[PDB]
């Protein structure tokens, strides 16, 4: 219930900064009746920009006025069966680099992005980097032998990791993988949290 | 930029969750082309409810997809002049209870809500109990004697604060004020944070 | 440098709450010279209880006065080779239940505890529970077929998960596993974050 | 309890990281028996440095192993009477610059540091610039006219605040005060949070 959430959250914030329907409606160029309406979940039709302005007026953020992602835990758990896991071909300049067998996700923890990654190429030098991403990542070499390279794309550090190897990659640090030269392909689990 | 922020964030999350315009538009029932537009700034007219399903599909929250409150500081600062304060006369049980002189606030501190409160009632017995509120609040008796009350509405704790008294009230703790009986009126600084 | 950290942090906090060496030394029953000394890293010999009292006086916590766990990232990464991963037999009432092949850890993120867990028993009913633990957990069925059971130890929910299954277990929720009846043994990856 | 807390936390972490007294005592070079004692409350005499290696072995921080600041509230509250404030006369360049009348503080809000500051100097030109400080600070001109300055020490921003002015200074922003030139003295409420 986006509207319901907004309705409860708007009300709170308004009172929080000591404003009555009238005070607020003014700053927004709206009628007190309207504001009062919104506090009823009748705001569902508001646009992103308006919500943007309402936040500004209330000196806070759209996030602060919208509700939590929600809960989807089955008494505290979510299960994803193997066959029903999303696949996503990944091409770096039309070069099939990875394949993403997306694992179980949850609104109770969106920062969590589990992945079984299929390393397609095995050309260490034809390895394409990523600028690094937000949140840390946990890696476990599933199959084959991954040839990891992190740091500066111009001259990065590196280590070929045998199956069984586990690695941590701090947030925002650039990295790239491929199999050991000539080995063909490899597999690893990638956990972004 | 309420959209611009949304644009780079939708992009961020889309990639984070290993998806493409093509795949995302699908779960939403939109044009693969349409998403692309959103990711380019054309999201401005998206309704609240509409934002709700999107953040859901990306198993995240609208907050996570909208930008932070802007930065409204003048080189990390902001002033408010005395004749510039918003005034809100409070009413509990149809009684000229308080008067809220709203002090400086910053988008960089949504939770900071500084107030000068003029306590108009001087009859403790007639005091009205808010239900408590979120966020801790620091108080300072500006003038007069503040007759305070906190805890349970029926059998509450009492405290007589002389001018200069300073107090802290934890978040969620219910409370009420008045000027000590007969003293007429009191004043105090109330900082919610 | 525990002492160095404390030395810098104590200094900050002291000034923060407006106290001079003398003011502080008093409340602690120490000499100003001593306090001044500590601010030099000469506090290394302080005991847990004393640090406990110093914190109290400064109205803060030992944590707030001690330094961050430190950094061990090799330019942003840590690698653990398969053979060098800690093993830990786990017996529930002398019943070899699990085996813990601990993966790469890091001071930059202690909440992260990666584990390859060897499910030894395969008696669903002889399954022993855990009261649930702090932080969420990500699970991936490595080998065999795990027989998961979560919730109330008296009557929990359950699902036998085929290899490839991935599950999320919210913090503090009780859980237990074993292989599918008769299958012998199973393996899964456990990520606590 | 500075130990009691440490005891249950060491226990917590030990288990969290999949270890036993036997294994932990090893990396520390202690008696498997010794750890057990720690886990039972006998940790009181552990030196700071000693705490440093322990938290290290458990790849975590001393903070994570020590308990939170206690709770010092009277049913979620605490008062401070005017003749009860700690007084600290400030000195910058050997000048009776400020005077700090320390208001109420709570262990439940380590960062809340409320102050009544008596500004003794009235020569802007003689003002001394702190280097900025952590945590945002809300100010209120109690009496007089506060001649303010913020930004760079050489070419700073100036602002003349009349009694009643309210201002916010972001964390890390350098600044200085005095009473407007010739006015003799000013007073203001400074709330660090
Ligand atoms: C394995 C890699 O970490 C996956 P990427 O972040 O490059 O998408
Ligand atoms: C003074 C009071 O603390 C302000 P209220 O909480 O009633 O809004
Ligand atoms: C697999 C389980 O999650 C490991 P436990 O938390 O019971 O130690
Ligand atoms: C008033 C000032 O803001 C207090 P200082 O930062 O100098 O400690
Ligand atoms: Fe990655
Ligand atoms: Fe209040
Ligand atoms: Fe677990
Ligand atoms: Fe300051």
Coordinates of C-alpha atoms in Angstrom, one line a residue, chain D:
Chain D
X1 CA 29.0 -5.6 34.0
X2 CA 31.7 -4.0 31.8
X3 CA 32.9 -7.6 31.9
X4 CA 29.5 -9.3 31.9
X5 CA 28.7 -7.6 28.6
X6 CA 32.1 -8.5 27.3
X7 CA 31.4 -12.1 28.4
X8 CA 28.2 -12.6 26.5
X9 CA 29.7 -10.7 23.5
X10 CA 32.9 -12.8 23.3
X11 CA 30.7 -15.8 23.5
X12 CA 28.4 -14.4 20.8
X13 CA 31.3 -13.7 18.4
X14 CA 33.2 -16.9 19.2
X15 CA 30.2 -18.9 18.1
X16 CA 29.4 -16.5 15.3
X17 CA 32.9 -17.2 13.8
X18 CA 32.6 -21.0 14.3
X19 CA 35.2 -21.5 17.0
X20 CA 35.6 -23.1 20.4
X21 CA 37.5 -22.2 23.6
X22 CA 40.2 -24.7 22.4
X23 CA 40.7 -23.1 19.0
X24 CA 40.4 -19.5 20.1
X25 CA 42.9 -19.8 23.0
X26 CA 45.3 -21.0 20.4
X27 CA 45.5 -18.0 18.1
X28 CA 45.8 -15.8 21.3
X29 CA 48.4 -18.0 23.0
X30 CA 46.3 -18.6 26.1
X31 CA 44.9 -21.5 28.1
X32 CA 41.8 -23.0 26.7
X33 CA 40.7 -22.7 30.3
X34 CA 41.5 -19.0 30.3
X35 CA 39.1 -18.1 27.5
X36 CA 36.4 -20.0 29.3
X37 CA 36.9 -17.7 32.3
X38 CA 36.7 -14.6 30.2
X39 CA 33.4 -16.0 28.8
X40 CA 32.2 -16.2 32.4
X41 CA 33.0 -12.7 33.6
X42 CA 36.6 -12.9 34.7
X43 CA 37.7 -10.6 31.9
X44 CA 37.7 -7.5 34.1
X45 CA 41.5 -7.2 34.3
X46 CA 42.2 -7.5 30.5
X47 CA 44.4 -4.7 29.3
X48 CA 43.5 -2.5 26.4
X49 CA 46.2 -3.9 24.2
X50 CA 45.1 -7.4 25.2
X51 CA 41.6 -6.5 24.1
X52 CA 43.1 -5.4 20.8
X53 CA 44.6 -8.8 19.9
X54 CA 41.4 -10.6 20.9
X55 CA 39.1 -8.6 18.8
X56 CA 41.7 -8.9 16.0
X57 CA 41.8 -12.7 16.2
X58 CA 38.0 -12.6 15.9
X59 CA 38.5 -10.2 13.0
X60 CA 36.2 -7.7 14.6
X61 CA 36.6 -4.5 16.8
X62 CA 36.8 -3.9 20.5
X63 CA 33.6 -1.9 20.2
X64 CA 31.8 -5.0 18.8
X65 CA 33.0 -6.9 21.9
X66 CA 32.2 -4.4 24.6
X67 CA 28.7 -3.5 25.7
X68 CA 26.7 -0.3 24.8
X69 CA 26.7 2.7 27.1
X70 CA 24.4 1.9 29.9
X71 CA 20.9 3.3 30.2
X72 CA 20.7 6.2 32.6
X73 CA 17.1 7.3 32.2
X74 CA 14.2 7.6 34.6
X75 CA 11.5 6.1 32.6
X76 CA 13.0 7.4 29.4
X77 CA 14.0 10.7 30.8
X78 CA 16.5 12.8 32.6
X79 CA 16.6 16.4 34.0
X80 CA 19.4 18.8 35.0
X81 CA 19.0 21.7 37.3
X82 CA 20.6 25.1 36.6
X83 CA 23.0 25.1 39.6
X84 CA 24.1 21.6 38.6
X85 CA 25.8 22.4 35.3
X86 CA 29.5 21.7 34.8
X87 CA 31.4 25.0 34.0
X88 CA 34.5 25.2 31.7
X89 CA 36.1 28.5 31.0
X90 CA 37.6 28.4 27.5
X91 CA 41.0 29.7 26.4
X92 CA 42.1 30.4 22.8
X93 CA 45.4 32.3 22.5
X94 CA 45.3 32.9 26.3
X95 CA 42.0 34.8 26.0
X96 CA 38.9 34.6 28.1
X97 CA 37.1 33.7 25.0
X98 CA 34.1 31.4 25.9
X99 CA 32.6 29.9 29.0
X100 CA 30.9 26.5 28.7
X101 CA 27.8 25.8 30.8
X102 CA 27.2 22.1 30.1
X103 CA 23.6 21.0 30.0
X104 CA 22.0 17.6 30.3
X105 CA 23.5 14.6 28.5
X106 CA 22.4 11.0 28.4
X107 CA 24.2 7.7 27.8
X108 CA 21.3 6.8 25.5
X109 CA 22.5 9.7 23.2
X110 CA 26.3 9.9 23.4
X111 CA 26.3 12.5 20.6
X112 CA 23.9 14.9 22.2
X113 CA 26.0 17.7 23.8
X114 CA 23.9 20.7 24.8
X115 CA 25.6 23.9 25.9
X116 CA 24.9 27.4 27.0
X117 CA 27.9 29.4 25.8
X118 CA 28.8 32.8 27.2
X119 CA 30.7 34.7 24.6
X120 CA 33.2 37.0 26.4
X121 CA 35.0 38.6 23.5
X122 CA 33.4 41.4 21.4
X123 CA 36.3 41.9 18.9
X124 CA 35.5 40.0 15.7
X125 CA 39.0 40.6 14.5
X126 CA 40.5 38.8 17.4
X127 CA 38.3 35.7 16.9
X128 CA 40.0 32.2 17.0
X129 CA 39.0 29.6 14.5
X130 CA 38.4 26.0 15.8
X131 CA 39.3 23.6 13.0
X132 CA 35.7 22.5 12.6
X133 CA 34.3 19.5 14.5
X134 CA 32.4 16.2 14.0
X135 CA 28.6 16.1 14.3
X136 CA 26.2 18.8 13.3
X137 CA 25.5 21.6 15.8
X138 CA 22.3 23.7 16.2
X139 CA 22.8 27.2 17.7
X140 CA 20.3 29.7 19.2
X141 CA 21.3 33.3 20.1
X142 CA 20.2 33.5 23.7
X143 CA 21.0 37.2 24.2
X144 CA 23.0 39.9 22.6
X145 CA 24.2 39.9 19.0
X146 CA 26.5 37.1 17.9
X147 CA 29.0 38.1 15.3
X148 CA 29.7 34.9 13.5
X149 CA 32.2 33.6 11.1
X150 CA 32.5 30.3 9.1
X151 CA 34.4 28.8 6.1
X152 CA 38.1 29.5 5.5
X153 CA 40.1 31.2 8.3
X154 CA 41.7 33.7 5.9
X155 CA 38.6 34.6 3.7
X156 CA 35.6 33.5 5.8
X157 CA 31.9 34.1 5.6
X158 CA 30.4 36.5 8.1
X159 CA 26.9 36.7 9.6
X160 CA 25.5 39.0 12.3
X161 CA 23.0 37.1 14.4
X162 CA 20.5 39.1 16.5
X163 CA 19.0 37.6 19.7
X164 CA 16.6 34.9 18.6
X165 CA 18.5 34.0 15.5
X166 CA 18.7 30.2 15.1
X167 CA 21.4 28.5 13.0
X168 CA 22.7 25.1 11.9
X169 CA 26.4 24.3 11.3
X170 CA 27.2 21.1 9.5
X171 CA 29.8 18.7 10.9
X172 CA 33.4 19.4 10.0
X173 CA 32.7 23.1 9.1
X174 CA 35.1 25.5 10.9
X175 CA 33.7 28.5 12.7
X176 CA 34.1 31.2 15.4
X177 CA 32.0 33.6 17.4
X178 CA 32.1 36.8 19.4
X179 CA 29.6 39.4 20.4
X180 CA 29.2 42.0 17.6
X181 CA 31.9 44.6 17.9
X182 CA 31.4 46.9 20.9
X183 CA 28.3 45.1 22.2
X184 CA 30.4 43.7 25.1
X185 CA 29.1 40.1 25.4
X186 CA 26.6 37.7 23.9
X187 CA 25.1 34.4 24.9
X188 CA 23.8 31.4 22.9
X189 CA 22.5 27.8 23.1
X190 CA 24.8 25.4 21.2
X191 CA 23.5 21.9 20.7
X192 CA 25.9 19.3 19.2
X193 CA 24.2 16.1 18.0

